[PDB]
Amino acid sequence: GEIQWMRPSKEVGYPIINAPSKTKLEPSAFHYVFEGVKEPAVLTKNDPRLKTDFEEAIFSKYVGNKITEVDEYMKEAVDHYAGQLMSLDINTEQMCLEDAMYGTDGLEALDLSTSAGYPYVAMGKKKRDILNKQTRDTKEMQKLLDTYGINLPLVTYVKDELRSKTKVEQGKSRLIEASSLNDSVAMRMAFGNLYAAFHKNPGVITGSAVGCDPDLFWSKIPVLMEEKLFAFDYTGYDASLSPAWFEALKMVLEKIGFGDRVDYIDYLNHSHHLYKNKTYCVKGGMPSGCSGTSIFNSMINNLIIRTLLLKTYKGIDLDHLKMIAYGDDVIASYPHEVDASLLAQSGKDYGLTMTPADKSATFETVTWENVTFLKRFFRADEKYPFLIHPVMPMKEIHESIRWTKDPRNTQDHVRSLCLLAWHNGEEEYNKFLAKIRSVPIGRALDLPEYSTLYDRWLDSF
Numbered sequence: 127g128e129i130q131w132m133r134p135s136k137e138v139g140y141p142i143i144n145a146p147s148k149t150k151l152e153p154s155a156f157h158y159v160f161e162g163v164k165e166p167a168v169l170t171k172n173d174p175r176l177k178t179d180f181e182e183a184i185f186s187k188y189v190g191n192k193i194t195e196v197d198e199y200m201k202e203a204v205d206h207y208a209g210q211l212m213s214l215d216i217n218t219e220q221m222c223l224e225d226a227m228y229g230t231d232g233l234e235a236l237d238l239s240t241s242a243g244y245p246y247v248a249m250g251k252k253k254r255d256i257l258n259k260q261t262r263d264t265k266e267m268q269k270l271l272d273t274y275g276i277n278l279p280l281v282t283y284v285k286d287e288l289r290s291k292t293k294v295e296q297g298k299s300r301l302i303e304a305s306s307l308n309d310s311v312a313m314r315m316a317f318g319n320l321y322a323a324f325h326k327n328p329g330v331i332t333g334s335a336v337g338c339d340p341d342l343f344w345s346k347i348p349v350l351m352e353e354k355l356f357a358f359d360y361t362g363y364d365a366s367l368s369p370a371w372f373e374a375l376k377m378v379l380e381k382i383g384f385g386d387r388v389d390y391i392d393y394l395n396h397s398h399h400l401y402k403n404k405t406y407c408v409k410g411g412m413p414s415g416c417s418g419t420s421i422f423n424s425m426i427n428n429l430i431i432r433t434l435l436l437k438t439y440k441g442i443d444l445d446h447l448k449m450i451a452y453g454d455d456v457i458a459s460y461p462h463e464v465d466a467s468l469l470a471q472s473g474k475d476y477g478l479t480m481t482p483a484d485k486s487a488t489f490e491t492v493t494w495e496n497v498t499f500l501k502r503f504f505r506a507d508e509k510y511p512f513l514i515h516p517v518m519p520m521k522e523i524h525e526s527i528r529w530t531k532d533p534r535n536t537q538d539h540v541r542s543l544c545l546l547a548w549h550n551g552e553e554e555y556n557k558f559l560a561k562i563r564s565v566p567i568g569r570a571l572d573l574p575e576y577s578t579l580y581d582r583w584l585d586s587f
């Protein structure tokens with residue numbers, strides 16, 4: 127990914143976008159009962175915590191575009207993956223505006239909380255209006271489409287969330303590139319069934335984990351994997367993607383019945399952005415808040431791992447490559463061991479920064495004991511080993527519980543954390559419940575006891 131030009135949104139007829147200069151995160155009722163070292167991310171250039179230029183920092187994610195063309199390896203990777211997806215017998219038809227808007231089996235309805243994007247964001251109108259759950263009114267969107275059309279600029283916000291002190295001092299705040307409701311609806315219409323198919327099929331055939339339910343899914347993973355596991359995480363995956371990776375993505379879509387509308391992928395690739403008062407153009411880079419980002423990122427990652435394997439191990443059998451990705455995150459396996467460090471090297475040649483899975487110092491052998499996927503570990507239940515526990519470290523939960531945006535969501539926020547936490551064991555869960563209940567706020571919450579959770583889990587399979 128690389129920014130081509132950036133300039134004043136007025137110099138080209140665009141309204142200045144407003145971004146709340148103050149975080150919505152404040153210490154929670156449990157801020158002192160639990161340990162944590164993360165704070166809200168820098169939202170403005172002035173933030174006192176800054177030890178470098180904010181503007182330069184937030185855009186440095188665009189490290190450039192390393193590759194230029196789609197080579198032989200990529201082309202083969204494309205073929206092989208497109209081959210697997212072919213076996214899913216995906217419905218290539220377009221999705222009727224209604225479904226694209228209010229959902230249908232395999233695709234949830236549009237999220238009402240997130241931005242409506244340009245022009246609506248500097249024009250006032252929200253999603254609350256245009257949509258209507260029980261009505262299912264295509265008419266308003268329908269009207270708004272013909273009026274403003276598609277392929278509309280992306281409104282870029284700074285994401286309000288917790289970040290390490292380092293990433294606070296270096297302005298490493300993550301950005302949210304929001305797509306207009308129009309684009310989002312169009313793409314959902316174009317790719318609606320693709321999304322459905324993926325959501326309904328997490329695993330090694332889609333090589334996607336998007337839509338998955340960790341509580342159930344973690345038990346199916348080990349079975350799907352090969353003997354030898356390998357994994358690594360990327361640094362700035364989204365922003366590092368070069369145009370060629372999008373082209374390869376279109377080749378896959380094309381090969382499975384969507385050559386029809388691969389044009390959309392073009393706007394994800396070469397895109398128009400609005401940040402504050404400035405406007406810019408980016409060549410490459412996957413926009414973080416578009417409809418499909420998550421999934422297309424996983425598809426591309428399926429192309430990347432294959433490519434690096436064909437390039438590094440001529441003669442490798444992709445048919446025995448068993449991997450599952452969730453965006454930049456990935457868990458993979460092969461009948462034979464492979465050199466992650468070496469694959470990481472080929473990665474640089476393709477514009478990808480790959481590093482030892484989970485900030486490890488160096489690349490170590492990946493095992494079922496140390497492997498993580500979505501920050502979660504894999505732990506077979508003591509009483510029924512054939513059931514695997516997705517295990518989120520407590521540190522993560524602790525960090526999350528020490529803050530809050532809306533006091534009205536404290537019940538749901540803690541409840542949610544409880545559903546992640548209990549997998550760390552009964553003893554751990556109770557210590558956790560104990561502290562939550564060591565202050566008025568906690569004592570008033572409706573939290574589930576271990577036994578209730580563990581039994582419910584057991585019956586869910």
Ligand SMILES: Nc1nc2c(ncn2[C@@H]2O[C@H](COP(=O)(O)OP(=O)(O)OP(=O)(O)O)[C@@H](O)[C@H]2O)c(=O)[nH]1
Nearest residue numbers: 285298300301302360361362363364365414453454
């Ligand atoms: N910008 C952005 N990235 C997002 C968002 N949601 C998920 N991500 C992902 O988060 C990544 C950036 O996260 P970071 O923690 O800044 O960087 P990282 O490369 O994963 O970690 P490091 O190796 O320590 O630098 C992107 O590459 C995406 O894969 C979002 O809303 N905005």
Ligand SMILES: [Mn+2]
Nearest residue numbers: 359360361362
């Ligand atoms: Mn990462």
Ligand SMILES: [Mn+2]
Nearest residue numbers: 359360454455
């Ligand atoms: Mn990740």
Ligand code: NA
Nearest residue numbers: 395397410411
């Ligand atoms: Na882009």
Ligand code: NA
Nearest residue numbers: 367368476477
């Ligand atoms: Na690249």
